[PDB]
Design a protein around this ligand. Structure first.
Ligand SMILES: O=C(O)C(=O)C[C@@H](O)[C@H](O)CO
Ligand SMILES: O=C(O)C(=O)C[C@@H](O)[C@H](O)CO
Ligand SMILES: O=C(O)C(=O)C[C@@H](O)[C@H](O)CO
Ligand SMILES: O=C(O)C(=O)C[C@@H](O)[C@H](O)CO
Ligand SMILES: O=C(O)C(=O)C[C@@H](O)[C@H](O)CO
Ligand SMILES: O=C(O)C(=O)C[C@@H](O)[C@H](O)CO
Ligand SMILES: [Ca+2]
Ligand SMILES: [Ca+2]
Ligand SMILES: [Mg+2]
Ligand SMILES: [Mg+2]
Ligand SMILES: [Mg+2]
Ligand SMILES: [Mg+2]
Ligand SMILES: [Mg+2]
Ligand SMILES: [Mg+2]
Lengths: 253, 253, 253, 253, 253, 253
């Protein structure tokens, strides 16, 4: 077996990838989402009730389907990153990255020694398919993709520095945390927030990195796609479930 | 503590109850559905991957919310009916009921001896809140609601006899099984099938029982409500989740 | 490895075994019970929300401790008896046994062909410790104990015939179902019910079988032990948990 | 999406398929087995501690890999067959089939009305990918494969009758149950047993059906493959795990 | 929907709330506790085998009942506090708080930017009921209650500074850790320890904060209630289960 | 009940203990390993998909069997160490220990105050059997065994200092991490790496501590036992499972 090819990572340079947020925290729900045809599925370990074991079950469901999995850990925690890479998550989205120093540590967290600090346990790992991928320890680093989130004033204050970190493949902008950080909590639609988001996307792409964002607003999502944003999540499974059930009931109240 | 009042059962005589099918088989998904405001939620133990323990978790989720839980067991299995009643399901929907003799057996399966054959285990049961409902063994039978499904030619061949069974509170028509039985598998919309459904609903109500049905077709659902159908399920969580994700992707393909 | 010795089964002829009902349906709760020192623990697959997998977890917990495990399946279902024996339950309590014919079928359900109808799958079974018990298929039958419950008028009507079945090790009287069947639901303490229980215990022991019963009433339990009842369950984990929390709150209201 | 093609079923006529028994009852263990390259993996619901939900998790793991899944239910139970088909098991191995009448009922259990009695619930089913396979109710029956086990004297007494049942794709011989039924429990290697197995395979193939068997004995397995046996399981995951760990310890005792 | 009202938080100023420790780490056991009528239930993520997912199941169970849930995380970990708030825990008890600086960080951990550092993920959260609480991000902070534990010499050394932190609603004294820190491990009943607890309670209340404590000793508990302690836990589910089973067995030995 | 004796700890001074790595992360798989007769079983919480709850289930499985459980947490996290000690892990293997200061912190993390910083929660803990071990808080520290891993250049740069820490019972060498740190990722067999391992084992034993290692290479394992290495793991469950299935398939390809 050759290592699983990270098509999400390759496509960061060749196309615009449409994503779905997966917060239903369940292998069965993850499989339903995997049938739809999204370019990527974000398995949310930060804001959905997930742990390593529930994330593994969702990787296993999704693996049969072309959709690429991206995992967001609860924080940029080196041991947790180690665990998520070993269960076979090839793309990580680190929340609340705020400095070049923190971004560099997240790069190292994803790479084996001697260049990185990723713990070695290939005999045990779904990532190597329990050494059925025979050259895994040589080929692993190449198919790993590191995305970091800028979603605080401190992150924006360190954007040029983060964008100069070799090994950051992409910067994702989270309008919820960012709008709240800017004192517009629950109102990311405000011009003050939007102008900052647009400038941030332009700077990301100007530094040769992939830009990403989430918007459930179709107009904002198509606007970000017209700017060239490489990875755009266009909704959230929990929101689509709740909204579809509410809209149906409303026809009968 | 007094026994939980089965408002679903009472409302069979006073209003038309709008329902949602719950096949996501998960306490977290069940809770999302419970927030919407459906009169009833059908926890599907026949066609979703549920067992006693996953149905219990969904009853516990839904219990904080006004929505009434109805449970469909995989078949009219007396021991399984005993297990679902003890975890505290107060309304059961029995699939594939085909005779008065079978319907009478389902009635007994729901009632304590000496009048029925429901096994006694009140010390252990969520149904009695572990005897915190102190008169449970005297008050239980009154808050249990039995629904049966007619979805075969044999059931339609025994409809008058089923409708004469004291203890059957409602007959639910399953258009999927029924249209397939009638040789229109996948096409319940056909006039031959629809005329049989309308006459069946009329005969059910004429005999003083509640009629029920599921249609995800808004027009058919509103037609069934115009006939006075007492319990109408108008959608399915798995279907709404898949369709909402597909419709969203299609805006970006 | 030699087959696990069924000490419960041996002690049916040598002492009076004190039991605890385990209906908390959980490996962790089962282990707490296992620490107390009861002779036997009844893992209730009939009136607690258990399945094969949760019963296995409770056998594994209890296995480190001297307490003997007894499993009650939901019904005398031959395939379910097969499953419980293969996960390693060496004593079964079959509810609602009503004839010599049913009791004989329960005997056969617990023995390998050619004498019985127990499905053969020793390579896969915790019962054989995956063939680490090398002579398991020769030695299994000796360490299996079959108990049946008489808890209906029909069972009482067939008691002499059930007591003549070679292979029934014990008859357990369930006062909840029996009092309900007799038209005293929730009031097993009535003299009419108690005279029938005493006569039943006497007949069981006169036929050389072990008699068993459950009572949470200390006085009734010690009365049953004075009669020579061989296996007496003296409480239920759910009841003791609920009662001890209620009694505590009452000191503070 | 077109229905998943049942390559196991097609290959019953074109090659000899090598199988592995999966009794570790776990999605993670099932994935390890799925990486090896077996033609088929038997997910054992009869002799391993599996339920519908654990079998679903193993189908999801295996689905990413070319190995074909076969599910053995605990018995030929029509509602359980319905559940296993809806979670997407395309090949079933029914234990302890003993008559043409029982084999015919198992055929019907796998086919939609009006020709069969498989319950219709395609909106809810992984089998239809929640109707993402748009013609599922028309295309399903074609990719379903029914295997039955002959493993009792009564089965052998009805072999010609079972082999004349249209819709039985294959007969699997279980040497453990059969050797025990013949009074050679734990010794299927005996000439009396082997001659019966060989004659049985010859009769199966002469009637145009696929023959199958399990042997962990390499010589017996290659002997059955030389006879033309179409589906041969050559070991058991629980046995290989236990034997590999025992052999390793023995080098160090 | 309006945000769930935190009645525990309100009652800190109006009454003395009686609590039960919940360490059985199970949704089913949590529901049994929920039925008793305690003012509050402490779901112990520090000393019982709980994770985010098992705490969620226990919140869902308890939510149907009047008892208020309080969650103790394993440590004052900001990302873990984020996760517990998003699953809907409205009151947190932070163990081993030792400085005003740590207490201030715990305050911030519970409030959205720009005033705090709580991660924003309202679309995904049971806390917002997946945005069915439409003004959640404006109304969340008011219904969150922060309790901190003082249970080390260093905490006692910083008590006045911790009591001056705006946003700490209550200080809970843990006599187990505190007696151990003081060199009386396992003997909190000693006068040296009790004088320090009484002085600590007095200082807490003098600073306008709520005081809390746990004692399974009825006399110590009523002494703490006579001092005006606002939240008093009076027992532990594991202890009551083990003690009630031991006391029962002792009547029969 | 007296505290469970840690025979693994005692045997560090009296014999050479043969170990098996347990990364199948499942109570059922752990039990299979427990039957084999290894001196110790390493429940891997670093490189297998385990959490506190799945490690507890494996401790409960293994507890019926002579094999001693050792738990590797994901990192030297003080709160996580507290959780694993309370579920009753008596021997811990800390990964990536790099200084005497870190080793001393791990010592304290394992000991109750006032000498250590282990949180006190004996009423709740399987470790105390919920206080059924009545003197647990006085007897606990004696049966806890602390192992640390040296697997970085920084650890080797601090080896003498780590070996001078009272409370470190053993130092385990992880050839995977170590060979990678040394710039021979995937090639621990290299003479440069092996000479460093031999000198390290010699220095560990010279300082009166137990030396440990894992090699799946029989020759290297027997070489390490010839040097007097006190605890030697000789295989990994996931590896043995995958290799045994692959070797079997290869006989039939
Ligand atoms: O896309 C963002 O802004 C995120 O980082 C996370 C997501 O959970 C939102 O907060 C939805 O509420
Ligand atoms: O409503 C009906 O027709 C049912 O009885 C069951 C439901 O599963 C549908 O068949 C969805 O496909
Ligand atoms: O002992 C009996 O009577 C039983 O067979 C079952 C037990 O669950 C009781 O019904 C408690 O309510
Ligand atoms: O192959 C057979 O004989 C079976 O039908 C099942 C299998 O479990 C064996 O009994 C192994 O013990
Ligand atoms: O109340 C306290 O002292 C605690 O903080 C925790 C509780 O677990 C006890 O330690 C019980 O042993
Ligand atoms: O023994 C070692 O080298 C370890 O520390 C961990 C183990 O996971 C191996 O790396 C297997 O790949
Ligand atoms: Ca289950
Ligand atoms: Ca977990
Ligand atoms: Mg964010
Ligand atoms: Mg139907
Ligand atoms: Mg009974
Ligand atoms: Mg068989
Ligand atoms: Mg404490
Ligand atoms: Mg290592």
């Amino acid at each position: 077996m050759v290592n699983t090819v990270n098509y999400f990572k390759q496509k960061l340079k060749t196309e615009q990838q449409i994503g779905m947020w997966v917060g239903l925290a369940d292998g069965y729900c993850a499989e339903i989402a995997a049938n739809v045809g999204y370019d990527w599925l974000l398995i949310d370990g930060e804001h959905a009730p997930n742990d390593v074991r529930s994330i593994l079950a969702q990787l296993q469901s999704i693996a049969a389907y072309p959709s690429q999995a991206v995992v967001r850990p609860v924080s940029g925690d080196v041991p947790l990153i180690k665990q998520l890479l070993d269960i076979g998550a090839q793309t990580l989205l680190i929340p609340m990255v705020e400095s070049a120093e923190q971004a560099e540590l997240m790069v190292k967290a994803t790479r084996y020694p001697p260049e990185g600090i990723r713990g070695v346990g290939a005999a045990l790992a779904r990532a190597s398919r329990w050494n059925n991928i025979s050259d895994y320890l040589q080929t692993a680093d190449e198919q790993i993709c590191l995305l970091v989130q800028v979603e605080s004033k401190k992150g924006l204050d360190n954007l040029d520095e983060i964008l100069n970190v070799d090994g950051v493949d992409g910067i994702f902008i989270g309008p919820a945390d960012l709008s709240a950080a800017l004192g517009y909590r629950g109102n990311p639609g405000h011009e003050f927030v939007q102008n900052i988001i647009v400038q941030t996307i332009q700077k990301i792409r100007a530094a040769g990195k992939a830009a990403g964002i989430l918007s459930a607003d179709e107009k904002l999502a198509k606007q970000y796609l017209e700017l060239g944003t490489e990875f755009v999540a266009v909704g959230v499974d929990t929101s689509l479930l709740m909204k579809s059930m509410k809209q149906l009931l409303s026809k009968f109240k």
